[PDB]
Design an enzyme around this catalytic site. Structure first.
Site, PDB file in Angstrom:
ATOM      1  N   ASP A  39     -17.683   3.410   9.883  1.00  0.00           N
ATOM      2  CA  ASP A  39     -17.715   3.790   7.649  1.00  0.00           C
ATOM      3  C   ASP A  39     -17.857   2.631   7.679  1.00  0.00           C
ATOM      4  O   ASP A  39     -16.728   1.362   6.564  1.00  0.00           O
ATOM      5  CB  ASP A  39     -17.038   4.747   6.985  1.00  0.00           C
ATOM      6  N   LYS A  43       0.786  -1.041  -0.282  1.00  0.00           N
ATOM      7  CA  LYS A  43       0.112  -0.156   0.615  1.00  0.00           C
ATOM      8  C   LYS A  43       0.968   0.953  -0.278  1.00  0.00           C
ATOM      9  O   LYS A  43       1.863   1.360   1.339  1.00  0.00           O
ATOM     10  CB  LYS A  43      -1.483   0.273   0.861  1.00  0.00           C
TER      11      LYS A  43
END
Lengths: 218, 325
Positions: free
Chosen positions: B204, B115
RNA sequence: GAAACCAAAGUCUUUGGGUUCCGGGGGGAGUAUGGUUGCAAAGCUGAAACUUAAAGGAAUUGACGGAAGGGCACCACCAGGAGUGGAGCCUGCGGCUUAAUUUGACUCAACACGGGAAACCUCACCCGGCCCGGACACGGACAGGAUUGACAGAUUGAUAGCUCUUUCUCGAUUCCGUGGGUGGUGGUGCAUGGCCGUUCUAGUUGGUGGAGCGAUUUGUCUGGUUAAUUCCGAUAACGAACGAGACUCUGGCAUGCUAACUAGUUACGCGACCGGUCGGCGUAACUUCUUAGAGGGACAAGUGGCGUUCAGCCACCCGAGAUUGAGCAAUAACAGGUCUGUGAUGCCCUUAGAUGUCCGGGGCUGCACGCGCGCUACACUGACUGGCUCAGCGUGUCCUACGCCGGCAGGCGCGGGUAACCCGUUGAACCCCAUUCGUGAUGGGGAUCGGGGAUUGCAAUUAUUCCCCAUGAACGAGGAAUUCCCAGUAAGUGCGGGUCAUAAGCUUGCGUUGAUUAAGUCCCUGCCCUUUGUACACCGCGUCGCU
RNA sequence: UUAAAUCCUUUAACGAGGAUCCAUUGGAGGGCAAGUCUGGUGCCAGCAGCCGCGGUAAUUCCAGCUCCAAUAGCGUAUAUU
């Protein structure tokens, strides 16, 4: 075409003032460029001593403008020095010339040995102090020539001094101070009192006081 | 790709030293803090500008170089190469909005996921915010993996880079059908209660942050948004995530829930919301450090005279003035 | 006096009152060594080798403040609306393929920019094929034709006199090989001659005078006020030039005026219909509507409040309008420049044609994926079905009226309009009024597909486009994130222009139905002033290994 | 001439048309007099007393051409004024 503004100017325009000496006698300010260009005329030549470009600090940025050092001189009489800064170079030059014509001074010329012929040298050893530059002019014998650095050589040549021993002290490298020092020295030639000018000065009427009735009409 | 593997390390790290303190770093400072090779670093900088490694800046008075987006990326991979984690590049790349996913391969040939944070205020601040993001994400990744959670395995972190376990699948948003909807639903509902047990609310927890592995195993990624259960609206963020999953399985797979988990359990698990006397050998080292500092200070003042740009501008106008006279 | 400053730091190139100590670019270094004093710590004295273009002192503008105050902006937020981001499709950019998928720009000024809707052209791209490609010098052929032009037929992907049967004409308009520099329907670079665009949108710049050795400053400012170096006014300043402003147009208003046989109304006749309705037809009424002109009309005019009682600011009556929008207005910086201008201009290239012309066929659409502007949707405030009634910007020698044949696209016949005349009272869509459906992937939604038919055109196969049947997919109001929006505005909704043979989900205009919330702030995101300060310093990267 | 010579001076003959009987050394950004000329090189080679020039239009390097200063001399290093 010239249309004068000052009272002196108007007098000059006609034929009421005969020579440039009548202005210097009463130490009147020459405020118009044309007055000098009328009396000396074709005799005034000019030397551009330096064109140094400087960058002006503006909020828009840096733009180039030129500083001109011009020494105007009628030989065998009168010198002047002018400094102007402008956008273009020709403009700077002409501005300097105009400014240098307003600054025209008479130089007293002396004799080294016995006073035979025309005067050729500085009357007595004078000095010109201008911002750490100390220029000394010294009476030299006939035909020695101006023994100096190039700039006061120019200035003294255009003064009509034939021969002079010079000596400079301090930061002679900065041209403005050097030229201005030498001009200051050369002006001081008339300011120096000798035994020659000891007689009580009889007073002539001033250009204003003499031609007062002619100035009524203008 | 990475061919040059000597002087490129030292020069690029020297930029990063100046980036932490100041905006655009001058070329005068670089050579002083990279003292191993002197003089020939200026041609290295000209090779760095060929790639997207450094950017040149000559605005008005500020003359120097700043590190780019891609240039910051190469520095982490160069550090991961020395730790023997990254060797070759895999091509399956999912280019996102906040981060980029790059497939990496080690010495063994085992494929891992990398990442790279791409936060996009000046670029100096943007490449500093990406530093704090990876260190925060790796902190949660270690905290969850140790506490039985089905997350990718943390391996190594370098500035903005995070190496994780390669879990290959499809995100929940682009799934047509699941063979067993009920077992998948109960698995996902357990993980919200699991996080709440450890004193965490996802915030979320949607279909956009869940990946299925062969339609059997639910994988969780992306953790910078996590909040404490000490928050006044703790049950609100808990219930919103529950209703998001409740409606989704009824919408996409037409599965109605029989179990309605609404338990507040804080905390039965670990609170993860926090997450002659002097010897001549020493004399030699101390004398060396004094003598290097005297030389480094003198080299700084020699490099500060490089101004070369100031002399070039002054020369152009002087030629114009003399020609016009 | 470099100067800040100094009645001493003055009486210094016009240099000499006496006299003691002491400095000679910065470092090395106030270190070593010697001597000496010191109980010691140390003190006094005190180098060199070598290294470096500087080390510094005064003053001055203010690029930058991680400084402070103001002010402003839905390219900012707040209260909200419409959303996009989720779905299908369309398109742009990446990326991916491919012979080619031609292309500059990559956080605004990258992103439906090249008017770029590409079957051909456009086309720059690819695969193929004919054709000839200068002048000059040398060597060959020609009047016992150099060469041009040429009917029909046979050739390859093409009606190739640029090949053979035909060789029939045409009278030098030369062409056949070799080359060497001195090649020009050249390319680019510079000197110079004319003319553009880019950033904000409020400043920019002299002249003369004054201040300083000079850099510089004053003008360009205490205060109030303004979008503002605006204004009042203060004053070592006074005056300017340039742009903004001003100028001009435009729009809103006139039952006042001037007119309108290509505008319209009213009244009056005739006719048709049930004392009324008629976009039926025919000249007396002159402008209300329509048009297009002149003249008006708004100037901070008036009142109240606030204000150094002035410059100005706020509120309010009357009024169509009290704060309309544009151009002009012909700035500053550009080292972005632009263009068939001149230089026996400098170079580089010219069977390596600075894209050689043409011919045929492809490609620009290709597709796992990202990132994005859009269209249609996700239905009940709806869909379908019938009925009803209203525009404006505009266009047109292809716009089309009217009849007939057509289920439907369309054909066939006949007219008007090079246009306030005809299309055209532009007969619009939303909407309104009734009908059927009834919360379901439903008749919502229409993708994708299968057959026909019709145009457009040299050509529709990789569906040009339109039409008719049948199939009927995802999609159940869309997460993080993000765009536009203060009133005839947003949003719904149609229409016209634009490239154009047909091509329109694009761009750009126009009407139509028409809102919620706001009239505040600097919180975020930025920008702009003003005031004040200013020319990367020091303390916290190494270990070992043989020559 | 001279010890004897040589040289100079003095003199017969021959001896000058530019490819000769051919002038060199330094330099050409500034200091500092003289090129934004042309080719080569591309922070390389090098130059440069100092300031600096060179990282692809080099007025500063290597060449060519052109010009300038001194001129049968002119550079360079060192001691010193």
């Amino acid at each position: 075409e010239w249309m004068p503004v000052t009272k002196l100017g108007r007098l000059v325009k006609d034929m009421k003032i005969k020579s440039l000496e009548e202005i210097y006698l009463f130490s009147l300010p020459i405020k118009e460029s044309e007055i000098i260009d009328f009396f000396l005329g074709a005799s005034l030549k000019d030397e551009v001593l330096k064109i140094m470009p400087v960058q002006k600090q503006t909020r828009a940025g840096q733009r180039t403008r030129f500083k001109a050092f011009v020494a105007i001189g009628d030989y065998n009489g009168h010198v002047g020095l002018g400094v102007k800064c402008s956008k273009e170079v020709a403009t700077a030059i002409r501005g300097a010339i105009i400014l240098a014509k307003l600054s025209i001074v008479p130089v007293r010329r002396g004799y080294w040995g016995n006073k035979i012929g025309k005067p050729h040298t500085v009357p007595c050893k004078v000095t010109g102090r201008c911002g750490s530059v100390l220029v000394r002019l010294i009476p030299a014998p006939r035909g020695t020539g101006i023994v100096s650095a190039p700039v006061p050589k120019k200035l003294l040549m255009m003064a009509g001094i034939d021969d002079c021993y010079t000596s400079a002290r301090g930061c002679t490298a900065t041209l403005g101070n050097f030229a201005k020092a030498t001009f200051d020295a050369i002006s001081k030639t008339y300011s120096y009192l000798t035994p020659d000018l000891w007689k009580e000065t009889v007073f002539t009427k001033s250009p204003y006081q003499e031609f007062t009735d002619h100035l009524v009409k203008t | 790709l990475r061919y040059m593997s000597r002087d490129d390390f030292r020069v690029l790290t020297a930029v990063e030293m100046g980036m932490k303190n100041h905006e655009i770093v001058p070329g005068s400072l670089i050579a002083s803090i990279a003292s191993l090779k002197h003089g020939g670093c200026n041609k290295v900088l000209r090779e760095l500008v060929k790639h997207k490694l450094i950017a040149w800046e000559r605005t008005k008075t500020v003359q120097g170089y700043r590190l780019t987006n891609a240039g910051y990326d190469y520095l982490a991979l160069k550090t991961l190469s020395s730790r023997q984690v990254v060797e070759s590049v895999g091509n399956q790349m999912g280019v996102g909005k906040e981060s980029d996913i790059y497939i990496v391969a080690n010495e063994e040939g085992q494929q891992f996921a990398l990442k790279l944070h791409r936060l996009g205020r000046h670029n100096v601040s943007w490449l500093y915010l990406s530093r704090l993001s990876a260190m925060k994400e790796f902190a949660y990744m270690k905290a969850l993996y140790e506490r039985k959670f089905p997350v990718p395995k943390p391996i190594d972190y370098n500035r903005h880079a995070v190496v994780m376990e390669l879990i290959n699948g499809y995100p929940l948003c682009q799934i047509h059908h699941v063979e067993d909807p009920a077992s998948v639903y109960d698995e996902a509902m357990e993980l919200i209660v699991k996080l709440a047990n450890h004193g965490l609310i996802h915030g979320d927890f949607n279909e956009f942050n869940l990946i299925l592995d062969e339609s059997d195993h639910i994988t969780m990624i992306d953790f910078p948004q996590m909040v404490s259960t000490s928050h006044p609206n703790a049950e609100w963020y808990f219930d919103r995530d529950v209703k998001c999953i409740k409606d989704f399985f009824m919408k996409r797979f037409s599965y109605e829930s029989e179990l309605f988990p609404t338990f507040k359990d804080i905390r039965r698990e670990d609170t993860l919301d926090v997450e002659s006397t002097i010897p001549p050998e020493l004399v030699k080292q101390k004398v060396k450090r004094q003598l290097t500092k005297q030389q480094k200070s003198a080299v700084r003042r020699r490099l500060q005279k490089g101004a070369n740009i100031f002399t070039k501008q002054r020369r152009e106008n002087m030629q114009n003035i003399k020609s016009s006279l």
